[PDB]
Amino acid sequence: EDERTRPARDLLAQVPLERVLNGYDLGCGPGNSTELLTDRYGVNVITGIDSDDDMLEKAADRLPNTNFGKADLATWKPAQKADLLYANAVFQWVPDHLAVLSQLMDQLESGGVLAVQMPDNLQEPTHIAMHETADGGPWKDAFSRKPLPPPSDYFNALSPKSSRVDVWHTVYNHPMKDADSIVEWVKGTGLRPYLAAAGEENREAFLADYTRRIAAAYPPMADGRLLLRFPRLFVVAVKK
Amino acid sequence: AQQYLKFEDERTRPARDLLAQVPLERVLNGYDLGCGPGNSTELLTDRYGVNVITGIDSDDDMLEKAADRLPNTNFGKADLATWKPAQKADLLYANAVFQWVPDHLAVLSQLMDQLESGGVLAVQMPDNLQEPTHIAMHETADGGPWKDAFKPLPPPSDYFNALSPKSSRVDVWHTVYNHPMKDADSIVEWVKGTGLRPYLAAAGEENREAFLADYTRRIAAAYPPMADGRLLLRFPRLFVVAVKK
Ligand SMILES: Nc1ncnc2c1ncn2[C@@H]1O[C@H](CSCC[C@H](N)C(=O)O)[C@@H](O)[C@H]1O
Numbered sequence: 001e002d003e004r005t006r007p008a009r010d011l012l013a014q015v016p017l018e019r020v021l022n023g024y025d026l027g028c029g030p031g032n033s034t035e036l037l038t039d040r041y042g043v044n045v046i047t048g049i050d051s052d053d054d055m056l057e058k059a060a061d062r063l064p065n066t067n068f069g070k071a072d073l074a075t076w077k078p079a080q081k082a083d084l085l086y087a088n089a090v091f092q093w094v095p096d097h098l099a100v101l102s103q104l105m106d107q108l109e110s111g112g113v114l115a116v117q118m119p120d121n122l123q124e125p126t127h128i129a130m131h132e133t134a135d136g137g138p139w140k141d142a143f144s145r146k147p148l149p150p151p152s153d154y155f156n157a158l159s160p161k162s163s164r165v166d167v168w169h170t171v172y173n174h175p176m177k178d179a180d181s182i183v184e185w186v187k188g189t190g191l192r193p194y195l196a197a198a199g200e201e202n203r204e205a206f207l208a209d210y211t212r213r214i215a216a217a218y219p220p221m222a223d224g225r226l227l228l229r230f231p232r233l234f235v236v237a238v239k240k
Numbered sequence: 241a242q243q244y245l246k247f248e249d250e251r252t253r254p255a256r257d258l259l260a261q262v263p264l265e266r267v268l269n270g271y272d273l274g275c276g277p278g279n280s281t282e283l284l285t286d287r288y289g290v291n292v293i294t295g296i297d298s299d300d301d302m303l304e305k306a307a308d309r310l311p312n313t314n315f316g317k318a319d320l321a322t323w324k325p326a327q328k329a330d331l332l333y334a335n336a337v338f339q340w341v342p343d344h345l346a347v348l349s350q351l352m353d354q355l356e357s358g359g360v361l362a363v364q365m366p367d368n369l370q371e372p373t374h375i376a377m378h379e380t381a382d383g384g385p386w387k388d389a390f391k392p393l394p395p396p397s398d399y400f401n402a403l404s405p406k407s408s409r410v411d412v413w414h415t416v417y418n419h420p421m422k423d424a425d426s427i428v429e430w431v432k433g434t435g436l437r438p439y440l441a442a443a444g445e446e447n448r449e450a451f452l453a454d455y456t457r458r459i460a461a462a463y464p465p466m467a468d469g470r471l472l473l474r475f476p477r478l479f480v481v482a483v484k485k
């Protein structure tokens with residue numbers, strides 16, 4: 001079982017519904033989260049939603065008997081009331097996501113579930129070192145988003161529409177071979193717009209400085225491995 | 241969707257979260273360490289069978305309660321500082337006990353030796369010494385006329401250093417749970433079972449009322465209400481799961 005799917009599984013484990021009839025995997029990507037939902041609930045009762053067509057084609061390939069749709073979550077609403085709105089590692093990219101989440105709950109039937117997970121990594125050395133490399137190099141002109149709200153803001157936003165709200169924060173640990181391994185990992189986690197802004201011809205110098213900073217920030221354990229942290233916030237709400 | 245909702249007991253949330261990460265389909269000789277009145281033990285017997293789990297505790301009154309509730313399950317008295325199973329274990333499960341055992345990390349590494357290959361050590365410990373609840377205990381103690389009367393968990397990397405050599409894999413994670421609370425008094429009531437007792441005892445009977453009053457004021461100041469007026473108490477907890485080499 002993949003360490004990459006651990007947050008999705010931990011989120012789903014907290015969904016209190018024994019059965020789902022109109023469930024959605026929001027920001028489904030290539031169908032890894034969606035397959036977790038279909039495994040639990042059935043292939044015919046989950047619809048994956050995403051804004052990226054290439055994601056939807058991969059998801060549809062992986063799950064040939066499951067429905068998929070293209071939409072922007074900033075405004076999306078289901079055709080009928082949902083009993084499950086599940087969204088693993090998407091809402092960090094949605095502006096004003098708390099308001100979006102509150103509005104989504106109006107799209108749930110009574111007893112329906114909203115379940116959301118978001119990375120909380122902006123203050124981890126991986127992300128701090130991105131700004132440092134950007135601001136400290138000869139490409140710094142190219143560089144001339146928001147923190148996650150505290151748990152209490154999720155209660156304030158969602159409690160008025162919910163019979164139950166549960167919020168928790170977990171810091172997972174992933175041993176990594178070396179600094180190069182962390183840098184490679186983080187290409188899928190936010191390094192990519194930094195490299196884009198720095199420029200193709202600066203790619204090597206940027207990555208070199210960034211790796212040095214990673215090596216400095218993540219000291220080796222006794223076995224030489226580095227310990228990368230993944231802080232993540234989880235919210236589960238049951239609609240009144 | 242209302243008819244399909246199924247809520248689990250919130251009081252066993254961390255024990256359940258811990259157990260969910262135990263990669264054993266079957267257990268033949270498992271132990272619930274610091275079993276207490278058998279809440280954790282029943283999670284284990286629910287999953288693996290009443291016959292394959294033994295609860296261990298140093299408190300006789302606890303074991304009696306657990307034995308009454310699980311009458312077909314084994315229970316033994318021991319101090320975890322020194323205890324080893326009389327036969328190799330395939331599961332050593334310990335929810336919210338090891339914070340009370342001196343030099344627990346040394347104890348855990350030694351306990352790995354008592355696991356068979358592929359066996360599992362699973363541990364959860366509270367990590368709330370730096371929470372406002374516990375800080376306010378020190379401020380109350382140091383600030384009152386009783387002032388004269390008056391260990392953090394190691395980082396995840398230390399758990400890897402101690403246990404990885406004896407393991408095919410180790411998993412460490414840290415979770416902050418949030419508990420909405422009615423009011424400041426309900427937080428005070430909670431921590432009377434969560435670390436306030438050594439204070440209070442140290443302060444003396446004559447100072448109990450005054451200590452508690454000041455402590456409550458500090459709690460009221462330290463926990464801002466949510467929009468609905470409820471307070472939000474955090475529970476930081478450390479989880480460690482190791483699979484024997
Ligand atoms: N505004 C938006 N509307 C719909 N999908 C969005 C979106 N913003 C980001 N996404 C999608 O959300 C996904 C984030 S990657 C996370 C995907 C998956 N749920 C998982 O568990 O891994 C990407 O597929 C991205 O295309």
Ligand SMILES: Nc1ncnc2c1ncn2[C@@H]1O[C@H](CSCC[C@H](N)C(=O)O)[C@@H](O)[C@H]1O
Binds near residue numbers: 274276297320334336
């Ligand atoms: N050194 C020690 N050896 C054995 N048991 C101990 C111990 N120190 C504390 N305990 C026991 O550990 C328990 C902690 S509270 C009970 C924890 C229970 N496993 C649960 O999931 O909630 C108490 O029953 C206490 O008697």
